[PDB]
Design a protein around this nucleic acid. Sequence first.
RNA 1: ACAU
DNA 2: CGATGT
Length: 135
Amino acid sequence: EEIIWESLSVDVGSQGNPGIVEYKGVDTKTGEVLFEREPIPIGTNNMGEFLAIVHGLRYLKERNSRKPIYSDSQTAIKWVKDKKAKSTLVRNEETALIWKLVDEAEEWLNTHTYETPILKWQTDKWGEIKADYGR
RNA sequence: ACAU
DNA sequence: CGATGT
Ligand SMILES: [Ca+2]
Ligand SMILES: [Ca+2]
Ligand SMILES: [K+]
């Protein structure tokens, strides 16, 4: 019902889907960019949404922060909860990098603990998530 | 249908 | 218009 302003917000941006993928995390309150991943040559929107959440978990754990993470992605929130990214993207030579990152993110989830609430950003009521790359 |  | 997902 109410935005939790003391939080981290994440989003993906891409050129094509599948296509070049990047992601970033921002302070929900100020918009300050806290991390940004170098573009990955080929991935999907949902792989990027997933990697952004997991990177957020790692970022907050390293800093002993109990802030929640917002994502607008129903898919990525579920994949994190399941510790399994059920992407349809072909695993081939071209997609090796994104798949390595996804595999490594799952591996981290399977070897670490966290209490970070992962919250759905309600775009229809609140506008675009603060980490949005725009049009 | 809903979320991107 | 297309694609990624539950
Ligand atoms: Ca998003
Ligand atoms: Ca966006
Ligand atoms: K659809």
